[PDB]
Scaffold this active site. Structure first.
Site, mmCIF file in Angstrom:
data_model
loop_
_atom_site.group_PDB
_atom_site.id
_atom_site.type_symbol
_atom_site.label_atom_id
_atom_site.label_comp_id
_atom_site.label_asym_id
_atom_site.label_seq_id
_atom_site.Cartn_x
_atom_site.Cartn_y
_atom_site.Cartn_z
ATOM 1 N N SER B 15 35.549 34.975 37.896
ATOM 2 C CA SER B 15 36.668 35.766 38.408
ATOM 3 C C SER B 15 37.538 34.974 39.399
ATOM 4 O O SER B 15 38.092 35.538 40.339
ATOM 5 C CB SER B 15 36.196 37.115 38.958
ATOM 6 O OG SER B 15 35.061 37.007 39.803
ATOM 7 N N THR B 183 26.198 34.994 30.316
ATOM 8 C CA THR B 183 26.922 35.320 29.095
ATOM 9 C C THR B 183 26.150 34.672 27.926
ATOM 10 O O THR B 183 25.233 33.880 28.160
ATOM 11 C CB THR B 183 28.399 34.879 29.196
ATOM 12 O OG1 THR B 183 28.478 33.457 29.255
ATOM 13 C CG2 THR B 183 29.104 35.461 30.414
HETATM 14 N N1 LIG Z 1 44.978 34.473 44.928
HETATM 15 C C1 LIG Z 1 44.943 35.742 44.520
HETATM 16 N N2 LIG Z 1 44.987 36.720 45.454
HETATM 17 C C2 LIG Z 1 44.951 37.996 45.057
HETATM 18 N N3 LIG Z 1 44.862 38.484 43.816
HETATM 19 C C3 LIG Z 1 44.811 37.493 42.910
HETATM 20 C C4 LIG Z 1 44.865 36.131 43.166
HETATM 21 N N4 LIG Z 1 44.773 35.406 41.988
HETATM 22 C C5 LIG Z 1 44.641 36.331 41.066
HETATM 23 N N5 LIG Z 1 44.635 37.612 41.552
HETATM 24 C C6 LIG Z 1 44.313 38.846 40.834
HETATM 25 O O1 LIG Z 1 42.905 38.953 40.755
HETATM 26 C C7 LIG Z 1 42.531 39.643 39.540
HETATM 27 C C8 LIG Z 1 41.466 38.862 38.811
HETATM 28 O O2 LIG Z 1 42.036 37.709 38.151
HETATM 29 P P1 LIG Z 1 41.980 37.461 36.562
HETATM 30 O O3 LIG Z 1 42.992 36.522 36.026
HETATM 31 O O4 LIG Z 1 42.064 38.791 35.823
HETATM 32 O O5 LIG Z 1 40.513 36.900 36.312
HETATM 33 P P2 LIG Z 1 39.927 35.623 35.566
HETATM 34 O O6 LIG Z 1 41.122 34.831 35.005
HETATM 35 O O7 LIG Z 1 39.145 34.925 36.570
HETATM 36 O O8 LIG Z 1 39.079 36.164 34.412
HETATM 37 C C9 LIG Z 1 43.829 39.914 38.772
HETATM 38 O O9 LIG Z 1 44.224 41.276 38.890
HETATM 39 C C10 LIG Z 1 44.825 38.929 39.398
HETATM 40 O O10 LIG Z 1 46.167 39.398 39.367
#
Ligand SMILES: Nc1ncnc2c1ncn2[C@@H]1O[C@H](COP(=O)(O)OP(=O)(O)O)[C@@H](O)[C@H]1O
Ligand SMILES: Nc1ncnc2c1ncn2[C@@H]1O[C@H](COP(=O)(O)OP(=O)(O)O)[C@@H](O)[C@H]1O
Ligand SMILES: [Cl-]
Ligand SMILES: [Cl-]
Lengths: 304, 304
Positions: B15, B183
């Site tokens: 995440s 996983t």
């Molecule tokens: N630096 C950050 N600060 C706050 N929220 C963020 C940041 N980077 C990403 N997000 C948010 O955190 C959430 C998790 O990221 P996500 O891309 O879905 O997960 P992953 O790519 O790790 O599977 C998303 O809703 C994204 O918009």
């Protein structure tokens, strides 16, 4: 540390005699580490100059290396402890005190193949009978060999030169066109390195192994090839191109040249090189197999 | 032809916001090809400068690339056609006539994850309902996208620059120490390239993604980390070393720096670099995530 892994891969249907070049390379290069992640198979044969035969289903053929320090059975290994113990006992002399046999904690222990690999993927928290870490808790036979993931990574780090031995053959890949008449995994360098937990910068070179007449163990073949439970096929240039594209060997071992006229195996040497070239692969046929023994491996440059 | 694959991988528990750097890199580099092999997941988010959000469970976040020519869902993909169609329709504008969406023939079609991946491995010759090649014979929705293995290889060959998007996260690897709380596959570059059928010489660089405070979606953690179905953990240097060792990223994207004091995220930048160095990895923290948007990705050299 890096670029120290020689990975022997099979470019066709898995019966190119990978075992021969693995043993030959182990003797020539003296890898301190030999590694594979074999699933149940008919075996991989290596015959030394003295005529000693090794038929391995579990252990790398590379255990013949004069500098053998580590024998590593990858996370992707699906093995019978019985078979493993039998192969260890048969190479007792090569597997002395100064030789560490490391079974990856997540290697799949075969009960007494598909069901075993599946049970491991099921990841049942109650099931303490599928992975080597777990089986090693009640089975002392493998406990002495079963390392931790950290010890596995540390064994690879401390390895000076590594012979990695890919399994089966490229066209038997789960994700090649013959699906479902294929093996349960891709038989590609990327997958082999993945199944042995070998980090990609450790890859020195890929030794691609081929037969002039590829054999299938009822599966399906390439359109530019025809049949000549063993099914012998004529050389497939298309098979080679596809194997070249994905596997990208740096060096090619063309085996079973002894079963063909000089023109026959020489044409295939040139075809392989054309296939390599056609698929952005600088692979050259470096080794020629003219029999099942160390002595029968010829440098291509010495015979043509 | 070769060294043209930028592979975005997650160094921790999945995440780290891989989706953000994937979208950011796609916009900065303009990959003509974006590729992944996602299994069912909570999604990967990308937010552009204009505030447009992409939450992808199937499609690469890289589809935002201004030079998008090919969208490739690898052999390792385990996807719902419904989810795929929904994501295609939502990015209809980005997926015009000059954009080819290629579903690998051996991609696993989810019925209506574990059972799907297992059914594919079962390789039942009668089962024409698990792989994309087969499902495409009765389901026209994917038939238009489902290519052959040859077309898949040809799409990769004809790709100028490729963004490969690794799935989940390194510590969620099937063969990492947390098994069976992991996983169904390794979340390592070798496995990602294997699952996307990317030949190893095509790898240009690995963009490793990290969070200052890694989060697990109940799994087990590293000894140098503690908890702060989401479980937020403090940075694990050991996790980083292990992720560095296996994944060997060339560049590191340290995300969620916005949730920590300058000293907090800066210390983790240095820790990651120490972990990289300690595991023969020349990785440097190049990108810093200070929010979920394209605008929030900072060049590390510009902020510290
Ligand atoms: N630096 C950050 N600060 C706050 N929220 C963020 C940041 N980077 C990403 N997000 C948010 O955190 C959430 C998790 O990221 P996500 O891309 O879905 O997960 P992953 O790519 O790790 O599977 C998303 O809703 C994204 O918009
Ligand atoms: N060039 C050759 N000519 C004849 N027999 C050979 C040659 N190379 C290998 N063999 C034999 O062919 C058989 C198949 O090879 P093997 O190593 O078991 O298969 P693979 O490594 O492809 O899984 C073995 O019994 C081996 O000794
Ligand atoms: Cl060399
Ligand atoms: Cl670059």
């Amino acid at each position: 540390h890096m670029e120290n892994v020689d990975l022997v891969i099979d470019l066709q249907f898995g019966s190119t005699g990978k075992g021969l070049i693995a043993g030959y390379l182990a003797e020539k290069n003296g890898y301190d580490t030999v590694i594979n992640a074999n699933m149940p198979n008919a075996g991989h044969t290596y015959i030394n100059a003295e005529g000693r035969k090794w038929m391995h289903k579990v252990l790398p053929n590379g255990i013949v290396s004069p500098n053998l320090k580590r024998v590593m059975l990858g996370a992707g290994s699906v093995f019978s402890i019985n078979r493993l113990m039998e192969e260890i006992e048969m190479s007792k002399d090569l597997l002395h005190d100064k030789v560490a046999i490391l079974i990856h904690p997540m290697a799949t222990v075969l009960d007494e193949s598909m069901a075993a690999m599946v049970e491991k993927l099921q990841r049942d928290p109650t099931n303490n009978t599928i992975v080597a870490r777990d089986v090693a808790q009640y089975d002392g036979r493998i406990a002495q060999y079963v390392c931790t993931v950290e010890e596995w990574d540390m064994a690879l780090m401390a390895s000076e030169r590594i012979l990695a031995e890919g399994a089966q053959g490229f066209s038997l890949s789960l994700n090649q066109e013959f699906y479902p008449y294929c093996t349960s995994r891709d038989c590609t360098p990327a997958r082999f390195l993945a199944d042995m937990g070998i980090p990609l910068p450790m890859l020195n070179k890929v030794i691609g192994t081929a037969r002039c007449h590829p054999i299938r163990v009822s599966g399906g073949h390439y359109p530019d090839q025809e049949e000549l439970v063993r099914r012998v096929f004529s050389f497939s240039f298309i098979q080679m191109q596809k194997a070249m594209w994905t596997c990208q060997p740096d060096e090619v071992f063309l085996n079973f040249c002894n079963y063909l006229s000089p023109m026959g195996w020489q044409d295939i040497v040139h075809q392989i090189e054309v296939a390599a070239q056609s698929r952005y692969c600088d692979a050259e046929v470096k080794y020629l197999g003219f029999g099942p023994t160390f002595n029968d491996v010829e440098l291509r440059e010495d015979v043509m």
